Amino acid sequence: QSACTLQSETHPPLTWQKCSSGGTCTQQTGSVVIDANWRWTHATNSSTNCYDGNTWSSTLCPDNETCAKNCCLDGAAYASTYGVTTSGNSLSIDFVTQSAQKNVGARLYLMASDTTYQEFTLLGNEFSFDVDVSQLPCGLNGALYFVSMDADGGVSKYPTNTAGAKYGTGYCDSQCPRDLKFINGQANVEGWEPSSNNANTGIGGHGSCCSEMDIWQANSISEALTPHPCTTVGQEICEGDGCGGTYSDNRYGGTCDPDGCDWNPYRLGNTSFYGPGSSFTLDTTKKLTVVTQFETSGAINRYYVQNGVTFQQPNAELGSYSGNELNDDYCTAEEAEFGGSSFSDKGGLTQFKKATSGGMVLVMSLWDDYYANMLWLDSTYPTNETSSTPGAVRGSCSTSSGVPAQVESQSPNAKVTFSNIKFGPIGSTGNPSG
């Protein structure tokens, strides 16, 4: 897709800190950009939409190539249309924003410049951030994660994509998403099937795959940490159901691991660690700090801080495994206890290390789940399972929770605030910010 300028594109600024082993942190200045799917897509020569509701213009978009040549992405009114605002080192995303139309959440990427994404090399380093999830009830997900996206949004690889990172193009994740309107410089109109429950979405013939590191997927009820390996580390197109993931009939028939080696304290047995109120170790009605460390062995460590008290990731006992570190033994024990084999089939942490060794783009999003109602995160899943089934219970939410139309109507004012992002070598982010 090309870029049009009927509406100006001004990326909201966002500062963060880069720390060093020497014990000092320095301020960096970046900005955020909204994903291309949220934008107005219209003809390059007029204001006629190329996409409207959940269908494509059959004349402007008869096929993937022609559509890309005829259509462009336009600017976004961040605050008024998408409920996205920033202030210093803080970013807030509103759940439902009402303007000309109704908008639900957002997916944003951290930029290095106005035209490029900021790339982070996680291996050997640690990432820290403060988060307020108090306004996120059952069914919602305020996420912060990394994906192996190209710094330019794919422009250098795909000439027909001239909009680039400035317009939030190039997304990919372990689900090999097929809902993306533009992939590899082309539209995703061929094989397009409109969603039955979402008036704005559909599923196309192609998907976009890549490694994904889910640092944080959570609400006030549950939280999970999950690495997802893929046989191909970076962004790669996929065909139909061979994509696997949430958008295909076969979830595990692809090149990426859509499940990952997840670590949810509640799912692991500690139902008193994270939740709303003082009866939990970490009170989700208050802001907290989340620190994730990527050691060179490929293992991942985690600790939290609230009101100046530090808590390491709670110990878990699963099969022959015991400890609080996400390593090869944990992931193997999890597959043995909870079942499944996609993580190991995709290479596990060894394959995943290839992603963290390279650059990864930071993503912050707020969304509700039109496919599984977020039950996999905060309820019992599958819903027909009982508490006696290992790993079925992931949270205290009712199995009837998370219906999009319902949560959007009942909790429109929900929101998430991410702030004070700090990145640097292991053991450095806890030091004084510059």
Ligand X SMILES: OC[C@H]1O[C@@H](O[C@H]2[C@H](O)[C@@H](O)[C@H](O[C@H]3[C@H](O)[C@@H](O)[C@H](O[C@H]4[C@H](O)[C@@H](O)[C@H](O[C@H]5[C@H](O)[C@@H](O)[C@H](O[C@H]6[C@H](O)[C@@H](O)[C@H](O)O[C@@H]6CO)O[C@@H]5CO)O[C@@H]4CO)O[C@@H]3CO)O[C@@H]2CO)[C@H](O)[C@@H](O)[C@@H]1O
Ligand Y SMILES: *[C@@H]1O[C@H](CO)[C@@H](O)[C@H](O)[C@H]1NC(C)=O
Ligand Z SMILES: OC[C@H]1O[C@@H](O[C@H]2[C@H](O)[C@@H](O)[C@H](O)O[C@@H]2CO)[C@H](O)[C@@H](O)[C@@H]1O
- Residues in contact with ligand Z by the rule CB under 6 A: 175, 214, 217, 226, 246, 258-260, 262, 376, 381
**103 near ligand X, rule: CB under 6 A:** yes
Q: Which of 198, 181, 200 is nearest to 36 (CA)?
A: 181
CB neighbour list of residue 107: distance below 8 Å, 6 or more residues apart: 34, 35, 37, 38, 171, 363, 364, 365, 367
- List 275's β-bridge partners, or say none: 283
Closest by Cα among 159, 200, 241, 196 to 38: 200
Q: How far is the CB of 297 from Co ion (least distance, A)?
A: 6
260 contact choice in ligand Z, Co ion, ligand X, none (CB below 5 to 8 Å, kind-dependent): ligand Z
Q: How far is the CB of 269 from ligand Y (least distance, A)?
A: 6
Cα–Cα distance between 377 and 137 in angstroms, integer?
A: 12
DSSP state of 293: E
- Pick the binder of ligand X from 344, 365, 373, 380 (CB under 6 A): 365
Nearest-approach distance from CB 79 to ligand Y, in angstroms: 39
Q: Which of Co ion, ligand X, ligand Y, none sits in contact with 314, Cβ below 5 to 8 A by type?
A: ligand Y
Residue 270 interaction partner, one of ligand X, ligand Y, ligand Z, none, beta carbon < 5-8 Å per kind:
ligand Y
Q: How far is the CB of 167 from ligand Z (least distance, A)?
A: 24
Shortest distance (Å) from residue 389 CB to ligand Y: 19
Pairing assessment for the beta strands 236-239 and 186-187 based on DSSP bridges = unpaired
Contacting ligand X (CB under 6 A), which of 173, 236, 283, 335?
A: 173
Q: Does 281 participate in binding ligand X (rule CB under 6 A)? A: no
If one asks whether residue 104 binds ligand X (CB under 6 A), the answer comes out as yes
Which residue from 107, 206, 267, 415 is in contact with ligand X, where contact means CB under 6 A? 107
Q: How far apart are CA 226 and CA 264, in angstroms?
A: 9
Which candidate, 132, 261, 244, 84, places its Cα nearest to that of 177?
Answer: 244
Angle of CA points 373, 376, 380, to nearest 5°? 95
* d(C-alpha 130, C-alpha 10), whole Å: 25
* Cβ-contact 56, 50 below 8 angstroms: yes
Would you state the torsion angle of the CA atoms of residues 420, 116, 152, 236, taken in this order, to the nearest 10 degrees?
A: 10
- For residue 207 the two structure tokens come to 């998907």
Choosing among ligand X, ligand Z, ligand Y, none, which partner's interface includes residue 81 (Cβ < 5 to 8 Å by kind)? ligand X
Using CB under 6 A as the binding criterion, the count of chain residues that bind ligand X stands at: 26
Residue from 5, 8, 58, 101 touching ligand X (CB under 6 A): that is: 101
x/- track of binding to ligand X for residues 189-218 (CB under 6 A): -----------xx-----------------
Q: What is the smallest separation between the CB atom of 375 and ligand Z, expressed in angstroms?
A: 9
Exposed / middle / buried, residue 197 (Cβ in 10 Å: 0-12, 13-18, 19+): exposed
Interaction with ligand Y in 286-325: which residues (CB under 6 A)? 311, 314
Among the listed ranges 98-106, 189-197, 267-275, 329-337, the one in contact with ligand X (CB under 6 A) is: 98-106
In the block, tokens 């001239």 appear at 162
Binders of ligand X among 6-45, rule CB under 6 A? 37-38, 40
Q: Considering only residues 66, 270, 285, 396, which one is a binding residue for ligand Y as defined by CB under 6 A?
A: 270
Site string for Co ion, 267-306 (x = CB under 5 A): --------------------------------x-------
Sign for the pseudo-dihedral over CA of 413, 414, 416, 417 = positive
* Span near ligand Y by CB under 6 A; candidates 136-144, 181-189, 267-275, 377-385: 267-275
CA torsion through residues 366, 163, 148, 27, sign: negative
Which residue stretch of 82-90, 189-197, 244-252, 265-273 sits at the interface with ligand Y (rule: CB under 6 A)?
265-273
CB 41 within 8 A of CB 73: yes
Residue 185's nearest CA partner among 72, 109, 107, 108 is 72
Q: Does 378 bind ligand X (CB under 6 A)?
A: no
Shortest CB 74 distance to ligand Z, Å = 29
Closer residue to ligand Z in complex, CB, 51/381: 381
The rounded radius of gyration (Å) of the Cα atoms in the chain is 21
Residue whose C-alpha is closest to residue 293's, from 122, 43, 431:
122
Three-class secondary structure of residue 110 per DSSP = strand
Given a contact cutoff of 8 angstroms between Cβ atoms, the answer to whether 321 and 310 are in contact is no
Q: Select 85 or 273, whichever has its Cβ closest to ligand Z.
A: 273
* Distant-in-sequence, close-in-space partners of 77: CB < 8 Å, separation ≥ 6: 7, 99
Residues binding ligand X (CB under 6 A): 37-38, 40, 47, 49, 51-52, 81, 100-101, 103-105, 107, 143, 173, 175, 177, 179, 200-201, 246, 365, 367-368, 370
Residues binding ligand Y (CB under 6 A): 270, 272-273, 281, 311, 314
